[PDB]
Design a protein around this ligand. Structure first.
Ligand SMILES: *C/C=C(C)/C=C/C=C(C)/C=C/C1=C(C)CCCC1(C)C
Ligand SMILES: CCCCCCCCCCCC
Ligand SMILES: CCCCCCCCCCCC
Ligand SMILES: CCCCCCCCCCCC
Ligand SMILES: CCCCCCCCCC
Ligand SMILES: CCCCCCCCCC
Ligand SMILES: CCCCCCCCCC
Ligand SMILES: CCCCCCCC
Ligand SMILES: CCCCCCCC
Ligand SMILES: CCCCCCCC
Ligand SMILES: CCCCCCCC
Ligand SMILES: CCCCCC
Ligand SMILES: CCCCCC
Ligand SMILES: [Cl-]
Length: 263
């Protein structure tokens, strides 16, 4: 049910996909250590936002590791190409994991936007419902990327509706709350918005690869898009969220944040 199963792979194609995923693992787990160490310089009000980046680093890192091992489990080099041995690799495992990681990405945004109490809980609930609707419909849609491309497109259209509503909530909360933000992070958070719009849109482009490049090189392109998108939406994003957290902490008078930025 996945286009990966349709092709034999050259060593170059197969090993490049493996190296992309392994590089992704190393980037996420290196970033994890950074987020862990700097969390002590974040004030209590914001510290969960940096903890959430640690959670996302390990959760996404584990899925990228799992995809890499599944990839090498599923194929063997036979007669000059990597040939399918087991019908077990699928990008669908990424979608299941997004059910956890996308809420974490959204929640750490809400924390540095200074949302509290009922608004934080209400906003998180609606964002997570929209995200889950997007993920579930996209997951069903990619089950058909071989058998029924029309069905892939229609589930993709429904998923995109959820995506667009989710992004409207995200953008509205960012632009309505950037005046609360301290230490110049009213500017920084605007760039976070655009980083999200760019990086998250790479995922529906990857989803459509079976429709516009259904060959072994499109399989590579999709893994490349996922890799660009993962590093941008989780690592670069998380570094920006943590910068905003530490900068607002120092502006609020948290001494460890002030001393950390002074060094
Ligand atoms: C770290 C993982 C992230 C930020 C994943 C984000 C995923 C999406 C924005 C997925 C979007 C989709 C659509 C807009 C339509 C096609 C189906 C999806 C689920 C791939
Ligand atoms: C006013 C408090 C917001 C409650 C949750 C709103 C969730 C939808 C956000 C739409 C843009 C404001
Ligand atoms: C304040 C404007 C920041 C814009 C950042 C660019 C991210 C989106 C560019 C997409 C162009 C294809
Ligand atoms: C070997 C190709 C690497 C692909 C992943 C690079 C991620 C780029 C995201 C933005 C980096 C500044
Ligand atoms: C394969 C190891 C990749 C390490 C990249 C370093 C990323 C820096 C994150 C702070
Ligand atoms: C797309 C096939 C792989 C699916 C991964 C596991 C999904 C189980 C929950 C629906
Ligand atoms: C307060 C209502 C905001 C609309 C959120 C829509 C998300 C779709 C989830 C079903
Ligand atoms: C210092 C932590 C980096 C761990 C990278 C592990 C890559 C398999
Ligand atoms: C007619 C093509 C529409 C495709 C919509 C799918 C978007 C992910
Ligand atoms: C992608 C939708 C952006 C919403 C911007 C709303 C500004 C108040
Ligand atoms: C002293 C550590 C500062 C960390 C800033 C976070 C974003 C780079
Ligand atoms: C990387 C271990 C495989 C399970 C993925 C959560
Ligand atoms: C405000 C519209 C954002 C568009 C992102 C592609
Ligand atoms: Cl992920």
């Amino acid at each position: 049910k996945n286009i990966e199963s349709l092709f034999d792979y050259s060593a170059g194609q197969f090993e490049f996909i493996d190296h992309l995923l392994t590089m992704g693992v190393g980037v996420h787990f290196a970033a994890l250590i950074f987020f862990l160490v700097v969390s002590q310089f974040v004030a209590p009000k914001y510290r969960i936002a940096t903890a959430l980046s640690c959670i996302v680093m390990v959760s996404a890192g584990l899925i990228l590791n799992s995809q890499a091992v599944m990839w090498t489990d599923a194929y063997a080099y036979v007669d000059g190409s990597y040939q399918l041995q087991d019908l077990t690799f699928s990008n669908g495992y990424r979608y299941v994991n997004w059910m956890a990681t996308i809420p974490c990405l959204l929640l750490q945004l809400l924390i540095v936007l200074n949302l509290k109490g009922k608004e934080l809980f209400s906003t998180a609930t609606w964002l997570i419902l929209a995200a889950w609707g997007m993920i579930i419909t996209g997951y069903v849609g990619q089950l058909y990327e071989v058998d029924d491309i029309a069905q892939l497109m229609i589930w993709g259209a429904v998923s995109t509706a959820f995506f667009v509503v989710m992004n409207w909530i995200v953008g509205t909360k960012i632009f309505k709350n950037r005046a609360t933000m301290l230490g110049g992070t009213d500017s920084t958070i605007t760039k976070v918005f655009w980083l999200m719009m760019f990086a998250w849109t790479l995922y529906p482009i990857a989803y459509l690869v079976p429709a516009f490049m259904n060959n072994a090189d499109g399989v590579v392109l999709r893994q490349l898009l996922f890799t660009i998108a993962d590093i941008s939406s989780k690592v670069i994003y998380g570094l920006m969220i943590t910068y905003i957290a530490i900068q607002q902490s120092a502006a609020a008078g948290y001494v460890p944040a002030q001393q950390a930025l002074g060094r």
